[PDB]
Structure 1
Amino acid sequence: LQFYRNLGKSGLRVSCLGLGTWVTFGGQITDEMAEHLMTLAYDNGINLFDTAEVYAAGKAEVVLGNIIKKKGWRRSSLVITTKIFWGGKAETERGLSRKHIIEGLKASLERLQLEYVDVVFANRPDPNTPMEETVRAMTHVINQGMAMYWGTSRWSSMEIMEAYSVARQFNLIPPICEQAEYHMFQREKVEVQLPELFHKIGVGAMTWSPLACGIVSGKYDSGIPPYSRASLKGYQWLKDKILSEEGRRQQAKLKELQAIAERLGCTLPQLAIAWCLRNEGVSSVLLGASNAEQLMENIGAIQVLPKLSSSIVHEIDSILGNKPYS
């Protein structure tokens, strides 16, 4: 019902749906399409756009930056987020050391043609760096005005709490969000681990791959369609996943879920996405889309949200048979 929500407990208001750029921008789709996708989204009230240095060797950031400059949107109306970790082949070009966080964010900013991002993310945890160093770097780039807030991605709740306590120990800035994978076939962390952090230290969740790369859409119910992500060069791993025995077992369940969708009056993707937004602990879902049709459809997930009754949810849990042990 509420289209805008706070990222965790920070004062930053993001749209419950955001558009990502992985695989697509600079890669699978044309820049014309990219611009169309972004305009469509922006005009529909989506203010959150996620990217990363690693995406397309940096091309994604360039394209996203290009569009923002061309459309001439007000920077204050946007919320750009970017992730740092893999910034090159050199030893010193990856990880969360002070050296890379600074050099990496500075480089991404250059590609984005922006003075700063609203939230910078540690793309994944780094065991080779002390937490204090990392929190100091994030805090540094924020005081330097290169970022407004910082978050973690793929961190255990233990590491998130470590960062938080380290921050309190040295009077630094705590992270305000965690970017966790979350969809019907991947629900352990967002439903068990993260909730406590939300109520304890205000850390919120910004989940990715709501459709499991398109698996949960239902487009694979009978083989690998042409031009689908699974068919792209470089995504054989996705193809394997879909054709595997578990891949089959999964598809068999989407068939069961379709009925749920029909009852709710929506489409499977709309349900899968609205599903992700049923818990308060989730601030936003980062959508993926390779064409305008997909995006225009997916945003409809907002209308489904009010119908996800306890009954409907329980029913879904039964069909999936994988509700995480509380």
Structure 2
Amino acid sequence: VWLANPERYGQMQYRYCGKSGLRLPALSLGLWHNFGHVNALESQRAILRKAFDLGITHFDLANNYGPPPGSAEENFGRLLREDFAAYRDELIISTKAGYDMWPGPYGSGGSRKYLLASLDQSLKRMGLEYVDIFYSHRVDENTPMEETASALAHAVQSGKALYVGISSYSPERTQKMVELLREWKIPLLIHQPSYNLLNRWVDKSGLLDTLQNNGVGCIAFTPLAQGLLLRLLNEMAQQRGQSMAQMALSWLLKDDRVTSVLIGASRAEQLEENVQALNNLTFSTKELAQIDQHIAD
């Protein structure tokens, strides 16, 4: 029997996701790695408990997370049922479908067959009635976006997803998806792109403006560039009373354009450091220019 920390909501900053009423924590936990059947459940248990104790109320999954595929969802579902029975309504749980999950022509992409069948498998694996957010995980150029949007819409209407999002869509396709979902009176909630100090396709392409103009939120995937977050950038971090990682997360969160950043963990202690990034979210024009200069150099 497990009692969550009563102060869990005291430090975490929460941000409204676009124009919606849903507040995500500034740091969200992704289950991309470390939650498969190759990892011991006890490590996983400790991570989830700690995350929630730090006020991280958002846990981001996908059908194919593991390895093997589906195992993150299964393990999460088990821990949910053992430790979080009394807390599910305090959690925002996402899953996704779009990458290779199972073999053959219905196990990948953006068809209504794949998306609705996969959502059903995801719900079964996790032991849920609905996910809070269901995503199309990537663009499928061979499925009309009408079909994808309409599958997402069915997910909402049937009560299997409270809200929907998209991941790794260009600005043009994001804009079309906003429009198609509006034909069903569904606002696109959120976009999940890969975005970090070293990879600014999001700024450069104008995706952040498309998101803001449509009131869609943004949650940054691989905010630490998969480990890379040179010596000079670390010195700048130290001058701010931050580790490199903390500065990198603080940088994404410096302004209201990013809703949240997706961190990962293989053990509980790694989470504490990352949430401290909230202690210092301000950057001077000078600092920003010097950061850009070191990256260019």
Whether 2:280 is the aligned partner of 1:297: answer no
1:42 to 44, 52, 63: 52
Whether 2:58 is the aligned partner of 1:65: answer no
Whether 2:234 is the aligned partner of 1:258: answer yes
Q: Deviating runs (4+, > 3 A) in structure 1?
A: none
Call closer, same or farther: CA 1:2–1:23 in 2, change over 3 Å: closer
Q: Deviations over 1:164-200 (max 9, x none)?
A: 22233x3342422110111111112146422221332
| 1:16-165 → structure 2 map (5 Å cutoff) | 16-26=26-36, 29-56=39-66, 57-71=69-83, 72-85=85-98, 86-165=100-179
Whether 2:274 is the aligned partner of 1:320: answer no
State TM-score, norm by structure 1. 0.83
Q: Deviations over 1:30-78 (max 9, x none)?
A: 2111111111110111101001111121000011111111112422100
Q: Are 2:63 and 2:95, in contact at CA under 8 Å, matched by a contact in 1? A: yes
Q: Are 2:12 and 2:25, in contact at CA under 8 Å, matched by a contact in 1? A: no
Task: State the 1:27 CA deviation.
Answer: 5.2
Match of 1:182 in 2: 195
Could you list the runs of 5+ residues in structure 1 that have no partner in the other structure? 217-253
Task: State the 1:81 CA deviation.
Answer: 0.7
What SS does the corresponding residue of 1:125 show, helix, strand or coil?
coil
Tell me the amino acid that sits aligned with residue 6 of structure 1: Y
Q: Are 2:164 and 2:188, in contact at CA under 8 Å, matched by a contact in 1? A: yes
Call closer, same or farther: CA 1:29–1:296 in 2, change over 3 Å: farther
1:268 to 220, 241, 244: 244
Tell me the amino acid that sits aligned with residue 35 of structure 2: F
Call closer, same or farther: CA 1:40–1:318 in 2, change over 3 Å: same
What SS does the corresponding residue of 1:81 show, helix, strand or coil?
strand
Aligned residues: 283
What SS does the corresponding residue of 1:282 show, helix, strand or coil?
coil
Tell me the amino acid that sits aligned with residue 212 of structure 2: H
Question: Greater CA deviation, 9-18 or 291-300?
Answer: 291-300
Provide the alpha-carbon RMSD of the alignment.
1.7
Task: State the 1:15 CA deviation.
Answer: 0.4
Tell me the amino acid that sits aligned with residue 50 of structure 2: L
Q: Deviations over 1:199-255 (max 9, x none)?
A: 321112111111111121xxxxxxxxxxxxxxxxxxxxxxxxxxxxxxxxxxxxx21
Could you list the runs of 5+ residues in structure 2 that have no partner in the other structure? 1-10
| Whole-angstrom distance in 2 between the partners of 1:99 and 1:257 | 47
2:221 to 175, 191, 208: 208
| Whole-angstrom distance in 1 between the partners of 2:221 and 2:184 | 31
| Whole-angstrom distance in 1 between the partners of 2:235 and 2:168 | 33
Task: State the 1:2 CA deviation.
Answer: 7.6
| Whole-angstrom distance in 1 between the partners of 2:77 and 2:287 | 41
| Whole-angstrom distance in 2 between the partners of 1:3 and 1:191 | 27
Q: Are 1:190 and 1:205, in contact at CA under 8 Å, matched by a contact in 2? A: no
Task: State the 1:160 CA deviation.
Answer: 0.7
What SS does the corresponding residue of 1:91 show, helix, strand or coil?
coil
| 1:231-242 → structure 2 map (5 Å cutoff) | none
What SS does the corresponding residue of 1:55 show, helix, strand or coil?
coil
Question: Greater CA deviation, 2-11 or 203-212?
Answer: 2-11
Call closer, same or farther: CA 1:2–1:193 in 2, change over 3 Å: farther
